[PDB]
């Protein structure tokens, strides 16, 4: 069921190594850290690719973080009722900006109890998404993976997926 | 725009 889709050309350098092409569609058998196996759909052939010259061809709506047609406002009370807390995020279509998405979080504070934060997610030309332009991502599913491992900029870290 | 938060960077 998982499918991911080459951003760059690779010319094999080690043994065991799949060659491949820009936009070539290849299926994940394992996912070792850095080098992951996979097998082509354009050739049948099998190997290990480059972890970072791929990005998830999945569906997005399977995935529990993203909450397809969803406000801002409702957005904030979603995350504010009981069952969720501070680090509980999800990302939404933009109501405003059409094309584009949110990420809401919410977070703790002295003073005001509890916030809940929008931030905006900049499209980038083709492969593309960022929310500072210090890193940018391929895909949804690369930007979320990131930033709950850390929050560089953001003002909380992403600990989990809004329950409803 | 139209802009929440700032923009972390």
Do not use: M
Request: with cysteine; aromatic share 10%.
């Amino acid at each position: 069921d998982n499918l991911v889709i080459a951003l760059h050309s690779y010319e094999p350098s080690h043994d065991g190594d799949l060659g491949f092409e820009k936009g070539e569609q290849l299926r994940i058998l394992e996912q070792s850290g850095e080098w992951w196996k996979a097998q082509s759909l354009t050739t049948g052939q099998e190997g290990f690719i480059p972890f970072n010259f791929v990005a998830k061809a999945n569906s997005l709506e399977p995935e529990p973080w993203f909450f397809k047609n969803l406000s801002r406002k409702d957005a904030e009370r979603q995350l504010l009722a009981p069952g969720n807390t501070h680090g509980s995020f999800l990302i939404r279509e933009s109501e405003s900006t059409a094309g584009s998405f949110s990420l809401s979080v919410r977070d703790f504070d002295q003073n005001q109890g509890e916030v809940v934060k929008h931030y905006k997610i900049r499209n980038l030309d083709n492969g593309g998404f960022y929310i500072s332009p210090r890193i940018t991502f391929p895909g949804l599913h690369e930007l979320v993976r990131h930033y709950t491992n850390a929050s560089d900029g953001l003002c909380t870290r992403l600990s989990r997926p809004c329950q409803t | 725009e139209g802009q929440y938060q700032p923009q972390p960077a």
